[PDB]
Design a protein around this ligand. Structure first.
Ligand SMILES: O=C(C1CCN(c2ccncc2)CC1)N1CCN(S(=O)(=O)c2ccc3cc(Cl)ccc3c2)CC1
Ligand SMILES: [Ca+2]
Length: 223
């Protein structure tokens, strides 16, 4: 997260870190045994880390669980990033508490202008790379599809939404991928891609979660 602030400890209880010996992506806990992330974060073996604040220091609230089933959206297009959503079933249910809790699926698509919270342990620099120890937070609004499509050098599909600032300075970045965009208590987006990080006229692009609620529930029930 570029231009954000350090989240208060365990104030984003649904946030998880996907680890394969190192943190490589984020995710959201949607129920005691299922996590939603980005398909581009796929790996054959993933350890999900919950209750984290400092990913490099054991604090006493962590629960590390291995992924049992890693399910990418059947239509994930690796070239356009369309359908960039993935579900991870944990090998065992987690203990839900104050620092480890679930986030609700959207009831409807949030309107442009809605203020949301983006979080992650991704790169904090607009140029170069710097991985933070502590979870970062960013308050950012959903942008009108017109500004989204216009700013993007690539095709923005109906399954994508821009969140951020046209002026730059604040944005998600590498390592935040798969992470949550929560607006009014509901998961509205998933960190997907962007041209650079925190660049003017280049807001980040996220998977529009409200378009997959049915697929999410169907997959969970069938697995
Ligand atoms: O420009 C790119 C790719 C992004 C994916 N991609 C397309 C191509 C066509 N359509 C959609 C996406 C091709 C260009 N990258 C530069 C930025 N990196 S990154 O720094 O690791 C990164 C990763 C995720 C991000 C997510 C957000 Cl929401 C904002 C910036 C982000 C930046 C990823 C690759
Ligand atoms: Ca820790």
């Amino acid at each position: 997260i570029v231009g954000g602030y350090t989240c208060q400890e365990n104030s984003v209880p649904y946030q998880v870190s996907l680890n394969s010996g190192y943190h490589f992506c984020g995710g959201s806990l949607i129920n005691d045994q299922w996590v939603v992330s980005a398909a581009h974060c796929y790996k054959s073996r993933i350890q999900v880390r919950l209750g984290e604040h400092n990913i490099n220091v054991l604090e006493g609230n962590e629960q590390f669980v291995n992924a049992a089933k890693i399910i990418k959206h059947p239509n994930f297009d690796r070239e356009t990033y369309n359908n960039d959503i993935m579900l991870i079933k944990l090998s065992s249910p987690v203990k839900l508490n104050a620092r480890v809790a679930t986030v609700a699926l959207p009831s409807s698509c949030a309107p442009a202008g809605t203020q949301c919270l983006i979080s992650g342990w991704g790169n904090t620099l607009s140029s170069g790379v710097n991985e933070p120890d502590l979870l970062q937070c960013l308050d950012a609004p959903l942008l009108p599809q017109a500004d989204c499509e216009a700013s993007s050098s690539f095709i923005i599909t109906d399954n994508m939404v821009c969140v951020g600032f046209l002026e730059g300075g604040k944005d998600a970045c590498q390592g935040d991928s798969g992470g949550p965009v929560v607006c009014n208590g509901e998961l509205q987006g998933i960190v997907s891609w962007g041209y650079g990080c925190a660049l003017p006229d280049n807001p980040g692009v996220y998977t529009k979660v409200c378009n997959y609620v049915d697929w999410i529930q169907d997959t969970i029930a069938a697995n």
